[PDB]
Every structure is written in structure tokens, then in C-alpha cells.
Coordinates of C-alpha atoms and ligand atoms in Angstrom, one line a residue:
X1 CA -5.2 -18.2 -32.9
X2 CA -3.8 -19.0 -29.4
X3 CA -3.0 -15.4 -28.6
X4 CA -3.2 -13.7 -25.2
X5 CA -3.4 -10.0 -24.5
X6 CA -1.6 -9.3 -21.3
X7 CA -2.6 -6.4 -19.0
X8 CA -6.3 -7.0 -19.6
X9 CA -9.3 -9.0 -18.3
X10 CA -9.6 -12.2 -20.2
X11 CA -13.0 -13.3 -21.3
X12 CA -14.9 -16.6 -21.1
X13 CA -16.5 -18.3 -24.1
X14 CA -19.7 -16.4 -23.2
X15 CA -18.2 -13.0 -23.7
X16 CA -18.1 -12.2 -20.0
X17 CA -15.0 -11.2 -18.0
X18 CA -13.3 -14.1 -16.2
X19 CA -13.2 -13.6 -12.5
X20 CA -10.5 -16.1 -11.1
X21 CA -8.2 -13.7 -9.2
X22 CA -5.2 -14.9 -7.2
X23 CA -6.0 -18.4 -8.4
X24 CA -4.1 -21.5 -9.6
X25 CA -4.6 -24.1 -12.2
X26 CA -4.8 -27.9 -12.3
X27 CA -4.2 -30.4 -15.2
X28 CA -6.3 -33.6 -14.8
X29 CA -6.9 -35.9 -17.7
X30 CA -7.4 -33.9 -20.9
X31 CA -8.4 -30.6 -19.3
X32 CA -6.9 -27.5 -17.6
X33 CA -8.9 -26.2 -14.7
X34 CA -8.4 -22.5 -13.6
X35 CA -9.6 -21.8 -10.1
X36 CA -9.9 -18.3 -8.5
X37 CA -11.9 -16.1 -6.1
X38 CA -13.7 -12.7 -6.4
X39 CA -15.1 -10.1 -3.9
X40 CA -18.7 -9.0 -3.4
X41 CA -20.0 -5.5 -2.7
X42 CA -18.4 -5.4 0.8
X43 CA -15.0 -6.6 -0.4
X44 CA -15.6 -10.1 1.1
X45 CA -15.5 -13.6 -0.3
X46 CA -18.6 -14.6 -2.2
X47 CA -17.5 -17.5 -4.4
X48 CA -14.6 -19.4 -5.9
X49 CA -15.1 -19.8 -9.7
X50 CA -13.9 -22.6 -12.0
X51 CA -13.0 -22.4 -15.7
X52 CA -11.8 -25.2 -17.9
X53 CA -10.0 -25.3 -21.3
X54 CA -7.9 -27.6 -23.4
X55 CA -6.2 -24.8 -25.5
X56 CA -5.6 -22.5 -22.5
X57 CA -7.2 -19.6 -24.4
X58 CA -10.9 -20.3 -24.5
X59 CA -12.3 -20.7 -21.0
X60 CA -15.7 -22.2 -20.2
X61 CA -17.4 -21.0 -17.0
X62 CA -18.5 -23.9 -14.7
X63 CA -20.1 -22.0 -11.8
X64 CA -18.8 -21.6 -8.3
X65 CA -17.1 -24.7 -6.9
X66 CA -17.2 -22.9 -3.5
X67 CA -19.5 -20.2 -2.1
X68 CA -20.2 -18.1 1.0
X69 CA -23.3 -20.3 1.3
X70 CA -21.3 -23.5 1.2
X71 CA -20.7 -23.2 4.9
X72 CA -22.1 -21.0 7.7
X73 CA -18.5 -20.1 8.5
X74 CA -18.0 -18.7 5.0
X75 CA -21.1 -16.4 5.0
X76 CA -18.9 -13.5 6.1
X77 CA -15.2 -13.8 5.7
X78 CA -12.1 -13.1 3.5
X79 CA -10.8 -15.9 1.3
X80 CA -7.9 -15.4 -1.1
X81 CA -5.4 -17.4 -3.1
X82 CA -7.3 -20.7 -3.5
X83 CA -5.3 -23.6 -4.9
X84 CA -6.4 -27.1 -5.8
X85 CA -4.5 -30.4 -5.9
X86 CA -5.3 -33.9 -7.1
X87 CA -4.7 -37.1 -5.1
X88 CA -4.0 -40.5 -6.9
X89 CA -4.6 -42.4 -3.6
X90 CA -8.0 -40.9 -2.7
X91 CA -9.1 -40.1 -6.2
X92 CA -10.6 -36.8 -5.1
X93 CA -9.5 -33.2 -5.3
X94 CA -8.5 -31.1 -2.2
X95 CA -8.8 -27.3 -2.1
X96 CA -6.8 -25.0 0.2
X97 CA -6.9 -21.3 0.7
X98 CA -6.2 -18.3 3.0
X99 CA -9.0 -17.5 5.5
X100 CA -9.8 -14.3 7.4
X101 CA -12.7 -13.2 9.5
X102 CA -13.6 -10.3 7.4
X103 CA -13.1 -7.4 9.9
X104 CA -9.4 -7.7 10.3
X105 CA -6.3 -9.8 9.4
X106 CA -5.6 -11.3 12.9
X107 CA -6.8 -14.8 12.4
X108 CA -4.3 -15.7 9.7
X109 CA -5.4 -19.3 9.0
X110 CA -5.7 -21.8 6.2
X111 CA -8.9 -23.6 5.0
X112 CA -9.6 -27.0 3.5
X113 CA -12.1 -28.4 1.0
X114 CA -12.6 -31.4 -1.3
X115 CA -14.7 -32.8 -4.1
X116 CA -15.1 -36.0 -6.2
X117 CA -15.1 -33.9 -9.4
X118 CA -13.0 -30.8 -10.3
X119 CA -15.9 -28.7 -11.7
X120 CA -18.1 -30.1 -9.0
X121 CA -18.9 -28.0 -5.9
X122 CA -16.4 -28.7 -3.1
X123 CA -17.5 -29.3 0.5
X124 CA -15.9 -27.0 3.1
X125 CA -14.3 -28.6 6.1
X126 CA -12.6 -26.2 8.5
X127 CA -10.3 -23.1 8.9
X128 CA -7.3 -23.4 11.1
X129 CA -3.7 -22.3 11.9
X130 CA -1.2 -25.0 11.0
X131 CA -0.4 -27.2 14.0
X132 CA -2.6 -25.7 16.7
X133 CA -2.3 -28.6 19.1
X134 CA 1.5 -28.6 19.1
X135 CA 1.1 -26.1 21.9
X136 CA 2.9 -23.5 19.7
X137 CA 1.9 -19.8 19.8
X138 CA 2.4 -17.3 17.0
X139 CA 1.6 -13.7 17.9
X140 CA -1.0 -14.3 20.6
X141 CA -3.0 -17.1 18.9
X142 CA -2.3 -20.9 18.9
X143 CA -0.7 -22.2 15.8
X144 CA 1.4 -20.6 13.1
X145 CA 0.0 -17.7 11.1
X146 CA -1.1 -18.7 7.5
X147 CA -1.5 -15.9 5.0
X148 CA -0.4 -16.2 1.3
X149 CA -0.5 -19.9 0.4
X150 CA 0.0 -22.4 -2.4
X151 CA 0.0 -26.2 -3.0
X152 CA 2.6 -28.6 -4.4
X153 CA 2.6 -32.3 -5.2
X154 CA 6.0 -34.1 -5.3
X155 CA 7.0 -37.0 -7.5
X156 CA 6.7 -39.5 -4.6
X157 CA 3.1 -38.5 -4.4
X158 CA 3.4 -36.6 -1.2
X159 CA 1.3 -33.4 -0.7
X160 CA 2.7 -30.1 0.6
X161 CA 1.2 -26.8 1.7
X162 CA 3.3 -23.6 2.0
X163 CA 2.3 -20.3 3.5
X164 CA 3.6 -17.1 5.1
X165 CA 3.9 -17.2 8.9
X166 CA 5.4 -15.2 11.7
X167 CA 3.7 -12.0 10.5
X168 CA 4.6 -12.7 6.9
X169 CA 8.3 -12.7 7.9
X170 CA 8.9 -16.4 7.4
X171 CA 7.8 -19.2 5.1
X172 CA 6.5 -22.6 6.3
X173 CA 6.4 -25.7 4.2
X174 CA 4.0 -28.2 5.7
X175 CA 4.0 -31.9 4.9
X176 CA 0.4 -33.0 4.4
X177 CA -1.5 -36.2 5.3
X178 CA -1.9 -39.0 2.7
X179 CA -5.4 -37.6 2.0
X180 CA -4.2 -34.0 1.6
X181 CA -7.0 -32.9 3.8
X182 CA -4.9 -32.2 6.9
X183 CA -1.4 -31.1 7.9
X184 CA 0.8 -33.9 9.1
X185 CA 3.8 -31.7 10.1
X186 CA 6.2 -29.1 8.9
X187 CA 9.1 -29.9 6.6
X188 CA 11.2 -26.8 7.1
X189 CA 11.2 -23.0 7.7
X190 CA 12.3 -21.2 4.5
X191 CA 13.8 -17.7 4.1
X192 CA 13.3 -16.5 7.7
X193 CA 13.2 -12.7 8.0
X194 CA 13.2 -12.4 4.2
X195 CA 9.5 -11.6 4.3
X196 CA 8.7 -13.3 1.0
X197 CA 5.1 -13.5 -0.1
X198 CA 2.8 -15.0 -2.8
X199 CA 4.9 -18.2 -2.9
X200 CA 4.8 -20.6 -5.9
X201 CA 6.3 -24.1 -5.6
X202 CA 7.3 -26.1 -8.7
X203 CA 9.7 -28.9 -9.7
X204 CA 11.8 -29.6 -12.8
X205 CA 14.8 -32.0 -13.4
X206 CA 15.1 -33.1 -9.8
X207 CA 15.2 -29.4 -8.7
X208 CA 12.8 -27.6 -6.5
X209 CA 12.0 -24.0 -7.5
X210 CA 10.3 -21.4 -5.3
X211 CA 9.1 -18.2 -6.9
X212 CA 8.2 -15.4 -4.4
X213 CA 7.1 -11.8 -4.4
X214 CA 7.8 -9.0 -2.0
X215 CA 5.6 -7.8 0.9
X216 CA 4.3 -4.4 -0.2
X217 CA 0.6 -4.8 -0.5
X218 CA -1.0 -3.8 -3.8
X219 CA 2.3 -2.2 -4.9
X220 CA 3.9 -4.4 -7.5
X221 CA 7.4 -5.3 -6.5
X222 CA 10.5 -7.4 -7.4
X223 CA 9.8 -11.1 -7.9
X224 CA 12.5 -13.5 -6.9
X225 CA 13.2 -17.3 -7.0
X226 CA 15.5 -19.9 -5.5
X227 CA 16.4 -23.5 -6.1
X228 CA 17.3 -26.6 -4.1
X229 CA 17.8 -30.4 -4.5
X230 CA 15.8 -31.1 -1.4
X231 CA 13.0 -29.4 0.6
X232 CA 14.6 -29.6 4.0
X233 CA 17.9 -28.0 3.1
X234 CA 20.2 -26.9 0.3
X235 CA 18.3 -23.8 -0.6
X236 CA 20.1 -21.2 -2.7
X237 CA 20.1 -17.4 -2.2
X238 CA 17.3 -15.3 -3.6
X239 CA 17.8 -14.3 -7.3
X240 CA 15.9 -11.6 -9.1
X241 CA 13.2 -12.5 -11.5
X242 CA 11.7 -10.0 -14.0
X243 CA 11.9 -6.3 -13.5
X244 CA 11.4 -4.2 -10.4
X245 CA 7.7 -4.5 -10.6
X246 CA 7.4 -8.0 -12.0
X247 CA 5.8 -6.3 -15.0
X248 CA 3.1 -4.8 -12.8
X249 CA 1.9 -8.1 -11.4
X250 CA 2.3 -10.6 -8.5
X251 CA 3.1 -14.3 -8.9
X252 CA 0.2 -16.5 -8.0
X253 CA 1.0 -19.9 -9.5
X254 CA 3.2 -21.7 -12.0
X255 CA 2.2 -24.8 -14.0
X256 CA 4.0 -27.3 -16.3
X257 CA 2.4 -27.4 -19.8
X258 CA 2.7 -30.9 -21.4
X259 CA 2.9 -31.1 -25.2
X260 CA 4.2 -33.1 -28.1
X261 CA 7.4 -31.1 -28.8
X262 CA 8.2 -30.8 -25.1
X263 CA 7.3 -29.1 -21.9
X264 CA 7.1 -25.4 -21.1
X265 CA 6.1 -23.5 -17.9
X266 CA 3.3 -21.0 -17.6
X267 CA 3.6 -18.2 -15.1
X268 CA 0.3 -16.8 -13.8
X269 CA 0.2 -13.4 -12.2
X270 CA -2.4 -10.9 -10.9
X271 CA -2.4 -7.2 -11.8
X272 CA -4.2 -6.0 -8.6
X273 CA -6.5 -3.0 -9.3
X274 CA -5.6 -1.8 -5.8
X275 CA -2.5 -0.3 -7.5
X276 CA -4.7 2.4 -8.9
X277 CA -7.4 2.5 -6.2
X278 CA -9.6 0.0 -8.0
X279 CA -11.9 -2.7 -6.7
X280 CA -10.5 -6.2 -6.5
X281 CA -13.0 -7.4 -9.1
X282 CA -11.3 -5.0 -11.6
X283 CA -7.9 -6.7 -11.3
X284 CA -6.4 -8.1 -14.4
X285 CA -4.1 -11.0 -15.4
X286 CA -0.5 -11.4 -16.6
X287 CA 0.6 -14.7 -18.1
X288 CA 4.2 -15.2 -19.2
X289 CA 6.5 -18.1 -20.2
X290 CA 9.0 -19.2 -17.5
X291 CA 12.2 -20.1 -19.4
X292 CA 14.9 -22.3 -17.9
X293 CA 18.2 -21.2 -19.4
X294 CA 19.8 -23.7 -17.1
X295 CA 19.2 -25.6 -13.8
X296 CA 20.3 -22.6 -11.8
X297 CA 19.1 -19.8 -14.1
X298 CA 15.5 -18.7 -14.8
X299 CA 14.1 -15.9 -17.0
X300 CA 10.7 -14.3 -16.9
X301 CA 10.2 -12.2 -20.1
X302 CA 7.3 -9.9 -20.8
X303 CA 5.4 -10.0 -24.1
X304 CA 2.4 -7.7 -24.5
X305 CA 1.0 -10.6 -26.5
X306 CA 1.8 -14.3 -25.8
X307 CA 1.0 -17.2 -28.1
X308 CA 0.6 -20.7 -26.6
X309 CA 0.0 -24.2 -27.9
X310 CA -1.2 -26.8 -25.4
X311 CA -0.9 -29.8 -27.8
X312 CA 2.6 -28.7 -28.8
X313 CA 3.6 -27.6 -25.2
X314 CA 5.2 -24.4 -26.5
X315 CA 5.0 -20.9 -25.0
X316 CA 6.5 -17.9 -26.7
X317 CA 6.0 -14.4 -27.9
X318 CA 3.5 -13.7 -30.7
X319 CA 4.9 -11.8 -33.6
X320 CA 2.3 -10.7 -36.1
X321 CA 5.0 -9.8 -38.6
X322 CA 7.8 -12.3 -39.0
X323 CA 9.6 -10.4 -41.8
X324 CA 13.3 -10.6 -41.1
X325 CA 15.6 -7.6 -41.4
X326 CA 19.2 -6.5 -41.7
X327 CA 20.4 -3.2 -40.3
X328 CA 23.2 -1.8 -42.5
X329 CA 25.3 1.1 -41.3
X330 CA 25.8 3.9 -43.9
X331 CA 29.4 4.7 -42.9
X332 CA 31.0 1.4 -42.1
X333 CA 28.8 -0.6 -44.4
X334 CA 28.7 -3.3 -41.7
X335 CA 25.5 -4.8 -40.4
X336 CA 24.0 -4.9 -36.9
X337 CA 25.1 -8.2 -35.2
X338 CA 25.6 -9.8 -31.9
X339 CA 29.2 -10.4 -30.7
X340 CA 30.3 -13.9 -31.4
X341 CA 26.7 -14.5 -32.5
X342 CA 26.1 -15.4 -28.9
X343 CA 22.5 -16.2 -27.7
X344 CA 23.5 -15.4 -24.1
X345 CA 21.7 -12.7 -22.2
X346 CA 23.4 -9.3 -21.9
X347 CA 25.5 -10.0 -24.9
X348 CA 27.4 -7.1 -26.5
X349 CA 26.1 -5.6 -29.7
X350 CA 28.7 -5.0 -32.5
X351 CA 28.8 -4.3 -36.2
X352 CA 30.0 -6.9 -38.6
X353 CA 30.5 -7.8 -42.3
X354 CA 27.3 -9.1 -43.9
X355 CA 27.8 -12.9 -43.6
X356 CA 24.1 -13.9 -43.8
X357 CA 24.2 -15.3 -40.3
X358 CA 21.1 -15.6 -38.1
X359 CA 22.6 -13.3 -35.6
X360 CA 22.4 -10.5 -38.2
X361 CA 18.6 -10.9 -38.7
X362 CA 16.0 -9.0 -36.7
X363 CA 12.3 -9.0 -36.1
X364 CA 10.2 -5.8 -35.7
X365 CA 7.4 -5.8 -33.1
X366 CA 5.1 -2.8 -32.8
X367 CA 4.7 -1.7 -29.2
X368 CA 2.3 1.2 -29.6
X369 CA 3.0 4.6 -31.1
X370 CA 5.7 5.1 -33.6
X371 CA 8.0 2.8 -31.5
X372 CA 8.9 -0.8 -32.1
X373 CA 10.9 -3.6 -30.5
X374 CA 14.0 -4.8 -32.3
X375 CA 14.3 -8.5 -31.6
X376 CA 17.2 -10.7 -32.7
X377 CA 16.3 -13.8 -34.7
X378 CA 19.0 -16.3 -33.5
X379 CA 18.2 -15.4 -29.9
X380 CA 14.8 -14.2 -28.9
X381 CA 16.3 -11.4 -27.0
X382 CA 15.6 -7.7 -27.9
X383 CA 17.9 -4.7 -28.5
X384 CA 18.4 -3.0 -25.2
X385 CA 20.3 -0.1 -23.6
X386 CA 22.5 -1.4 -20.8
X387 CA 21.3 -0.3 -17.3
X388 CA 18.7 2.1 -18.9
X389 CA 21.5 4.6 -19.5
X390 CA 20.5 8.1 -20.6
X391 CA 23.9 9.3 -21.7
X392 CA 26.4 9.3 -24.7
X393 CA 28.5 6.1 -25.1
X394 CA 25.8 4.0 -23.6
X395 CA 26.6 0.4 -24.7
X396 CA 23.9 -1.5 -26.4
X397 CA 23.2 -5.2 -25.6
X398 CA 20.6 -7.9 -26.1
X399 CA 18.4 -8.5 -23.1
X400 CA 15.3 -10.3 -21.9
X401 CA 12.2 -8.5 -23.1
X402 CA 11.1 -6.4 -20.1
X403 CA 8.8 -3.9 -21.6
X404 CA 11.2 -1.2 -20.6
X405 CA 11.5 2.0 -22.7
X406 CA 15.2 1.3 -23.1
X407 CA 14.0 -1.5 -25.5
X408 CA 11.6 0.6 -27.6
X409 CA 12.9 2.2 -30.7
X410 CA 11.4 4.7 -33.2
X411 CA 12.3 4.7 -36.9
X412 CA 12.7 8.1 -38.6
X413 CA 13.1 8.4 -42.4
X414 CA 15.8 10.8 -43.6
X415 CA 15.7 9.8 -47.3
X416 CA 16.5 6.5 -49.1
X417 CA 16.3 3.3 -47.1
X418 CA 18.3 4.8 -44.2
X419 CA 16.8 5.8 -40.8
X420 CA 17.7 7.3 -37.5
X421 CA 16.7 4.8 -34.9
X422 CA 16.1 6.8 -31.7
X423 CA 15.5 5.3 -28.2
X424 CA 12.2 5.9 -26.4
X425 CA 14.1 6.5 -23.2
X426 CA 16.0 9.7 -23.9
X427 CA 15.7 10.1 -27.7
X428 CA 19.4 9.3 -28.3
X429 CA 19.9 7.1 -31.4
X430 CA 22.0 4.1 -32.4
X431 CA 25.6 5.1 -32.9
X432 CA 28.7 3.2 -34.0
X433 CA 31.4 4.1 -31.5
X434 CA 34.0 6.5 -33.1
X435 CA 32.5 6.0 -36.5
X436 CA 34.4 2.6 -36.5
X437 CA 34.6 1.0 -39.9
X438 CA 36.0 -2.3 -38.8
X439 CA 34.5 -5.5 -37.6
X440 CA 33.6 -5.7 -33.9
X441 CA 32.8 -2.0 -33.8
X442 CA 30.9 -1.4 -30.6
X443 CA 27.3 -0.4 -31.1
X444 CA 26.3 2.3 -28.6
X445 CA 23.9 5.2 -27.9
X446 CA 24.6 8.8 -28.8
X447 CA 23.0 12.2 -29.4
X448 CA 21.9 13.0 -32.9
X449 CA 25.0 14.4 -34.6
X450 CA 23.9 13.9 -38.2
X451 CA 26.8 11.6 -38.7
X452 CA 26.6 8.8 -41.3
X453 CA 27.6 6.3 -38.5
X454 CA 24.1 7.0 -37.0
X455 CA 22.3 6.1 -40.2
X456 CA 21.0 2.6 -40.8
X457 CA 19.6 0.8 -43.8
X458 CA 16.6 -1.6 -43.3
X459 CA 17.1 -4.6 -45.6
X460 CA 14.7 -7.6 -46.2
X461 CA 15.7 -11.3 -46.2
Ligands
GAL501 O1 21.6 -5.7 -17.4 C1 21.2 -4.6 -16.6 C2 19.7 -4.4 -16.8 O2 19.4 -3.1 -16.2 C3 18.0 -3.0 -16.1 O3 17.7 -1.8 -15.4 C4 17.4 -2.9 -17.6 O4 16.0 -2.7 -17.5 C5 17.8 -4.1 -18.4 O5 17.5 -3.9 -19.7 C6 19.3 -4.4 -18.2 O6 20.0 -3.4 -18.9

């Protein structure tokens, strides 16, 4: 049972809450290593924990790979967003992170560490602002500011370190030394003035992808991404990813999951407790599948429960009840279907003669209360009210599962096998436009009028 309950604090095999906040993950050999950090009683760095697992569900605690006692400089400081990377040349692992003095956020510098073994305790080197000796000054201190950070290993074996500089206004991609333990130079300045934070750098099909959040502290915001053929130039504009709050989380890292059937990408996010005035140690996690519709189109869906298989390399929503259904309209006699049976996102929903097609079959996922999600079978997209409309004539379409109320539906029995499927957003129910009795009849949203065109039959397949 490789199921994951989003919006909660995962537990280790010991039954204790996992504390690897704002962390990344590394795949070395036959093991996945999850690294992260957690505060003490004074909201300061006390230790970086390490968990390993082969199924990505059952994590084994391996103690602190880094601690406040690991170095006299770490006794009292703020460390966040620790990422690790492996080096084929050296044969050792190098850890990077964001370092602060612990009394304010003026230092804005990066830190380095390394170890012979992943689960082994790293040895702290030094904290510094990227390229201090270049005689460059960034807001009074020497060297570029380094806040939110993340690591990336290219195909050619080159190491890279990206962080937020110029008061979090710009992004800096630094080319690392062959040993990954130092910064050789900077590759390019990305998205200046955009003020993008919590950067995540990944690569697929010769394309470079950069997932970033917004700069609004604990407040969950809109996550975005961009692609490019090279790192120096050719970067596309920022495109939205997920909803307006990234499903109440902030992107921390993205990792390719190798399997037998193929490869899928795991999005890791942090649900910072600071959103509700909670301690950093209370923060939760949000893992989601990053789908690549195309080379220039990504989708980050939200599933309250996500099933994953490492050996298979598959990441998708977990549906406890896979019973397929067909919604038949009382009036028209037609069944709920997707226009042209398209699997494309934002596809129009129309009625059609029962032809036993996949596009006419639907799943039913309970989402708490008397409400459920109506997910199409052919395309994993769910029934959705376009632009979260609250008015009559609101066109219905199939959209990426975003946990929005415009995607939750309540079934109400009115006798026989017919129901009145109302929306959780405004209460208005599913309605065939103009009582249409022909094929291609636009399925919409409308007030309860007691008309047969608003009555649907639930049929098994
Ligand atoms: O395509 C427009 C989008 O508007 C969003 O506000 C809504 O949550 C999505 O379901 C989709 O309708």
C-alpha cells in the first residue's frame, strides 16, 4: 500500500513524526535519501536529519548528518533548505544550504559540507556569500546575497548551485568546482526583478526546467515554472503552476523517479505552519506528481491521497473505489461525455448518445462530507466549473484536480436511480443547456429548477 496522505506530517518506521522540513532528496544506488532541517526551542538550527527508503513511503531515521555541534559556527545560527548532491569524480557527497547568524537576515550566505557516506555525518566547511573576492558588493556586504537555495547536477557531470540574490529580487546560477565544494563562477542571472523564491532546478529531454515560488513569507502563493534549452540563455516567460496557493505549500525540490515502466517526477513541498501561527517543527508536507503534458507544458495536480511505486516508476492519484460509472440524463437520455472524447485540459463537457466509449465513464472519489470528485476515466481530469463561476449558464469542463470546491459535487437522491448533482461552490447543479435533447448538448451549471434536464442516472459498467 504505497499511499501518501497529503496535508499531514508523515511518520518514520518508528512511529515518530518525520522532521525533514524544506529538504531535498537524493537517489544513490538502490536507496532514496531524504534530507531536511528542523528548529530547536529558540527557532534556530539544531540538526539536519536523514531518512532513507526504497519504496518512498516507509522512511528509516538515520540520525543527524549535520548538527549545531558539528562546528563552532553552527552552535547558534539559522540554516534552511539543505540540499545534497553526489559526485562521480570525487565519490563523495556535498551538502549545501542557506546560512544566517540567528539574530537577523543580513548575512545572506551559503554553506558547504561533505561526507564519504550519505547517512554518515557530514563535516562542515564554511559559510560565505558567492564570489566574495570578485570585489563585488551586494547591499553593504562583499559577495552576492544567498537566501533560498538548491542544487543541480547536469548530464556532463557539472555541478550547479542556484540561490536568491539582490535582496531576493534576482536569481543566480553558480557554476561549481569539479569537487562541488566551491563556487567556480556564475553561469547567468535569471529572472531579475521577478523576485522568485524557493527555486527548484531539474532537467528532462534536453530541456532545463525551473520551478519557483513567490516571495511572500509563510503565505502560500502562486508557483511558476519556465523552460530553456541552455542555462545561459533561451529562458521562457514564467508560466503558472498549480493554483493560487500551490495547494497550500511551497516548492522545495523535484526529483526524477526511475522505474521499470518509465520515469515520473516527484514534487516535494512544505506546508509551513507559520501560515497559522505555528512553530516550524509543526510544518507538514505536500507531495505531488509533476506531469509533463509536453516539452513546454507542465501540470501540478493535487490529490489528497497519492499512490506511488518506485520499482514501477509511476506516480498517480490513489482511488480506493475504481468502480466506473455512466451519468445518463433523464430528459435527453444522453450520457455525460467529453467533447470529441478529448483528453486535453479545459475540454468542454457535452452530452452524447451512449456509445460505450471511455470518455463516457467516470470515477467517484470521496473528498470528505457528502461531496465527491467526478473524475473522467479516459483522461484523469475531473469535472470542473470553468473559472469557479457562481452563476447560471456556467460552462462545465474537465480540469486538473486542484482541490477547488468548483470540483466537488454532492449527490442527492430524488427517487429511482436519478440524482441532483449540486456543486459545493454555490449549490447550483448540473444542467443541460436549454434542455437540449441532441448530441453535443452543452453541459452547464444552473439553479435547481426541478427540470428533468437536471436529473442524472448513475449506471455501473
Ligand atoms: O481554466 C480556468 C481555471 O480557473 C480557476 O480559477 C479554476 O480553479 C480552474 O478550475 C479553472 O476553471
